[PDB]
Structure formats: structure tokens, C-alpha cells
Amino acid sequence: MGGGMNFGAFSINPAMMAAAQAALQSSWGMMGMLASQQNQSGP
């Protein structure tokens, strides 16, 4: 969005863009973190 697009939490705004992106994505992240720990763990 409007900024340097790197982390969203610094390189756009103070936390704001990473928080807005991750707030709902963390719910889908819960299944992704469990699957990628022992069922799809890569290098």
C-alpha cells in the first residue's frame, strides 16, 4: 500500500499496516503454523 512495502510495521507505518494485514490472517495462520511444523516443514 502507500509506503516502502517491506514489513508494514515500520517500513509503511508504526505497526499499523502489519497489524491490519495480520489481524485476520493470524486465524488462517493457526492452521498453517501447525501444518508447516510436522506435515509440510521445509528448509
C-alpha of 11 from chain center: 14
Three cell numbers, residue 9: 510495521
* Domain residue ranges of the chain, discontinuous segments joined by +: 1-43
Task: Give the Cα separation of 29 and 20 in Å (integer).
Answer: 14
CA atoms within 13 A on the CB side of 23: 9
- What is the longest distance spanned by two Cα atoms in the chain? 37
Deposited experimental method:
NMR
- Cβ contact 17:3 at 8 Å: yes
